[PDB]
Amino acid sequence: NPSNWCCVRLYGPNFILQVYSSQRKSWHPVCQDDWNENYGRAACRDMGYKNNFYSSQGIVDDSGSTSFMKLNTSAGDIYKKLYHSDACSSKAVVSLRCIACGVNLNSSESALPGAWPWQVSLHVQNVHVCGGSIITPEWIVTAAHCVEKPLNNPWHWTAFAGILRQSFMFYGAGYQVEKVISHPNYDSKTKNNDIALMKLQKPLTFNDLVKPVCLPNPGMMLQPEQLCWISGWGATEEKGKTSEVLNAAKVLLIETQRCNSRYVYDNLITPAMICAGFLQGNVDSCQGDAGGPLVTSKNNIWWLIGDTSWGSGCAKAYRPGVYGNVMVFTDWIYRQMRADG
Amino acid sequence: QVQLVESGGGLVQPGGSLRLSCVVSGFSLDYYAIGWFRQAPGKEREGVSCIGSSGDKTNYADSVKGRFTISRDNAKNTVYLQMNSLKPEDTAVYYCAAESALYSDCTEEQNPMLYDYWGQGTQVTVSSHHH
Amino acid sequence: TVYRRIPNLPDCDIDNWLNNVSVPSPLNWERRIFSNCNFNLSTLLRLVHVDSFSCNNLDKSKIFGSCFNSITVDKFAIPNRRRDDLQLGSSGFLQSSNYKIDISSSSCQLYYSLPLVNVTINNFNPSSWNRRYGFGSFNLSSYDVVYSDHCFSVNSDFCPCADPSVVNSCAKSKPPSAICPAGTKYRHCDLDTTLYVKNWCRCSCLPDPISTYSPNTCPQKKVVVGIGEHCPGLGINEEKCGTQLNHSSCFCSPDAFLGWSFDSCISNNRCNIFSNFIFNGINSGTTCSNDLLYSNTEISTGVCVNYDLYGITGQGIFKEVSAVYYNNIIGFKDFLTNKTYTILPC
Ligand SMILES: *[C@@H]1O[C@H](CO)[C@@H](O[C@@H]2O[C@H](CO)[C@@H](O)[C@H](O)[C@H]2NC(C)=O)[C@H](O)[C@H]1NC(C)=O
Ligand SMILES: *[C@@H]1O[C@H](CO)[C@@H](O)[C@H](O)[C@H]1NC(C)=O
Ligand SMILES: *[C@@H]1O[C@H](CO)[C@@H](O)[C@H](O)[C@H]1NC(C)=O
Ligand SMILES: *[C@@H]1O[C@H](CO)[C@@H](O)[C@H](O)[C@H]1NC(C)=O
């Protein structure tokens, strides 16, 4: 069963390549020893990124792990070759980035062009219905409740990227969506596991206005109330209509423990959820649309921490926004990307 | 439903050993750090040990450093705390708690507010009673 | 300084004020203003069991023989664990929520003590709105002194109870409700429908006005006491106010009032007391020290001196003159010697 199986991951803001040790219950970094670009592309294809490959180099291990994985100097799949070595010869572990992501417009309300190049508007019947985040030239992260029946068919959806104004999303200009995959454990009753993937029929052309956001790795080591950003065409006022122009705002993460308080959401926040906003209220984080991006800046990289899931009203006290926890979905996303190609 | 279930607590002689176990349900250990905390009677809850989502990162408070040992079984979704050379000072209610991996896996000082999910705990008393 | 006191002025009896048997708590610290009277600082320091006396913006020695427009004496019993809060400029609970010592005024802090047999601690809550919604009284043991942890101000239309007509529809977290007095606004509660939870009642000041996650929505606003101000009120847990046990009106249980504590004043079988002396109008007025005599009979002439002649305050150069010259400048007849003078500005 694919869920029971795992293998490989990227850990931390420095993309430390980690392999799981059969029967030892543990992750181990990889020695730079005899590593090259081909091995990095192999690991990326193992994670489901296909021919995508950005960089691979040697960095210092900051995870504090027990042992490393060193490829047998010559054993003749090279995957088994990696045995439990106590140290690396090159004194360096493998940093591997499979795709150029997390970069936007440097600092220089209404969103600026290129400020959120991963933001996409998802339309049905020529009308902006949801938002999403670019992760590959052909893959978009959104919410599962956006694509529930009867919108589970990919032919209902068109994606618009690099465009800030809805009025400038004309009939014909958006990329057709080929596949829609809801999370298998999505529960519309509780909005648990509210995440879905859209694969486009045609690859996006990346530029200053259209770029992907990095998927979050385990061990990001974010602050308890880490400052994050939300963006979208979300109605600023309740019951309001879709904002014509793209907007963005800053929010702070809210501890899940504090978010599950009785006088907040009273144990409705699951491990598949994170909370963000402001508890006291009065702060307009309503700009975001459902499935839109929740991102944070760490190690000078923009990471997708959450996708807009649910929330009682908006800018309401004791009712912060609840987002899907992309960190716990990154493996499922990798699996879906690998199973496609 | 997410549950954390502690067991293995009991009454033990000073210098004895116990093995606490914590069964985790509702989420994967690959994305969450698991800590053992203890609360003494009428004292604040203090961090005892921590194992990260990677399984290699382990941290221990200086009061039990080198005497206790935390471990995890991902296949069994069970975290074990081996308490060796138990002292009367170790008498407390031992709780199992889970924190996400978005934040730091294991800290040197275990902040209980970073941990989002809690079990009910098991009582451990270390006194001279019956060998 | 040339001093001419008004004759037959009464004694200020500041010792009688400090040694009064009714001793207030810092929450209800008491004030007495002395004016148009004579005092003896050494006699005061003897009659009062003085533990410490220190002045700010005023020389201790210059009090003797000097006059003042008024002397303001504030007093209250010292809760022991809070004594360090009385340090000048401290941000402790006493100066934050009970009595702020004005560090800019010419003041003197007097720490003294009284024998336990002659002391009755007066613990009273001065908050008008706390009593309006049922404060009650402090049921404490003898010599326990109350102090505030957190002060809260509310507008005149404040009411801590929820509207029963709204509460009747509450399905979750049903707050207690009662009838608010006319002209007041009921506690705000929203009916929310989070996820599948219908008619979830979410009210202001949760969990309490001290730790409320939304201070902006809680009408009880945290405040620090100003100079010469009392604590406007203790925090009210609005979740314990719709009990409406009787009187058919909004009434809060006594354990709903938060942000207050107490400690004993007793040390060495004596109750410690703090007093603040604020000296208004130094070298002016008629509240004069008799510690030094009216040796001003020999008025210094030809030198620039401050003068207070029967209440007329100024500065000038005295030059002795006869009545023929009186037959830009002022002058007076000193009735002690009947000598006439002139006063030129310095
Ligand atoms: C201590 O308290 C005051 C301080 O002057 C005096 O008692 C009365 O206090 C009330 C306060 O409102 C005044 O209105 C009265 O004029 C005061 N005098 C009388 C005779 O009632 C008095 O000095 C002391 N009271 C005692 C010892 O009972
Ligand atoms: C590496 O492979 C060779 C050939 O299969 C084997 O003999 C050896 O034991 C392996 N491990 C090493 C060299 O550590
Ligand atoms: C208490 O007051 C009475 C009456 O004025 C006085 O006689 C007595 O000395 C006082 N107690 C002490 C310890 O001074
Ligand atoms: C006041 O407190 C005492 C204990 O200090 C207690 O015995 C008494 O019953 C209390 N009074 C009331 C009215 O509760």
Do residues C97 and C149 make contact, with C-beta atoms less than 8 angstroms apart? yes
CB neighbours of C255 closer than 8 A, spacing ≥ 6? C240
Do you know the residue count of chain A? 341
Token representation of residue C125: 């809550």
Chain centre distance of CA C346: 39
**CA pseudo-torsion sign A167, A172, A173, A179:** positive
Token pair of A2 as six digits: 């694919």
The two structure tokens encoding residue A25: 């219950």
Does A75 contact ligand 2 (Cβ within 6 A)? yes
Kindly determine whether residue B116 and residue A220, on different chains, have CB atoms separated by under 8 Å: no
Strand ranges of the sheet holding C304-309, from the earlier edge strand across to the other edge: C2-4, C304-309, C312-321, C339-344, C333-334
| β-pair partners for C248 | none
Q: Distance between CA atoms of B117 and A259, rounded to whole angstroms?
A: 12
Residue linked to tokens 């935390």: B70
Tell me the H-state helices in chain B.
Answer: none
The C-alpha atoms of residue A228 and residue A224 are separated, in whole angstroms, by: 11
Q: How many CB atoms within 10 Å of residue C170?
A: 18
Structural domains in chain A, sorted by start: 8-97 (3.10.250.10), 111-341 (2.40.10.10)
User: A259 to chain C: nearest residue by CA?
Assistant: C213
d(CA C271, CA C80): 9
C115 alpha carbon to ligand 3 midpoint, in Å?
8
Cβ–ligand 4 distance for C327 under 6 Å, the answer no
What is the token pair recorded at A227? 């400052």
Ligand with minimal distance to C140 CA: 4
Ligand 4 centroid distance, CA of C89 (Å): 37
Residue with CA closest to ligand 2 atom 14? A72
Of A33, A71, A72, the residue with max ligand 2 atoms within 8 A of its CB, to mutate for a pocket test, comes to A72
Q: Residue C298 contacts by C-beta under 8 Å, 6 or more apart in sequence? A: none
Q: Measured from the CB, is residue C255 less than 6 Å from ligand 4? A: no
Half-sphere exposure (CA, 13 Å, Cβ side) for A200?
24
Cα A12 to Cα A28: distance, rounded to the nearest angstrom: 13
C85 backbone dihedrals φ, ψ, rounded to 5°: -65, -15
How is residue C330 annotated by DSSP? B
Domains, in order of start, for chain C: 2-148+268-282 (3.30.70.1840), 152-255 (no CATH), 298-344 (no CATH)
CA dihedral (C338, C344, C345, C346) positive or negative: negative
Q: Give the span between the Cα atoms of C116 and B117, in whole angstroms.
A: 53
From chain C, which residues contact A within 8 Å (Cβ)? 173, 190, 192-197, 202, 206-207, 213-217
How many whole angstroms from C227 Cα to the centroid of ligand 1? 25
Q: How far apart are CA C187 and CA C252, in angstroms?
A: 13
Per-position DSSP letters for B109-126, written without gaps between them: S--GGG--EE---EEEEE
Bond before A271 cis per omega within 30 degrees: no
What gap in Å lies between CA C99 and CA B45, rounded to an integer? 36
Q: What are phi and psi of C326, to 5 degrees?
A: -70, -25
Helix or strand (DSSP H, E) at A258:
helix A256-259
CA separation for the pair C29, C245 (Å, rounded): 32
**C301 φ, ψ to 5°?**
-105, 145
Q: Resolution of the deposited coordinates, in angstroms? A: 3.5
Using a CB-CB distance cutoff of 8 angstroms, which residues of chain A are in contact with residue C194? 265, 268, 312, 319
For chain A, what is the radius of gyration of the CA atoms?
A: 20
Burial of A182 (0-12, 13-18, 19+ CB in 10 A): buried
Map residue C271 onto helix, strand or coil. strand
Pairing type for strands B58-60 and B68-73 reads unpaired
Q: Are B117 and B4 in contact (CB under 8 A)?
A: yes
Residue with tokens 């109350």: C146
Mind listing the domains of chain B with CATH numbers?
3-126 (2.60.40.10)
- The answer to whether the CB of A128 falls within 8 A of the CB of A166 is yes
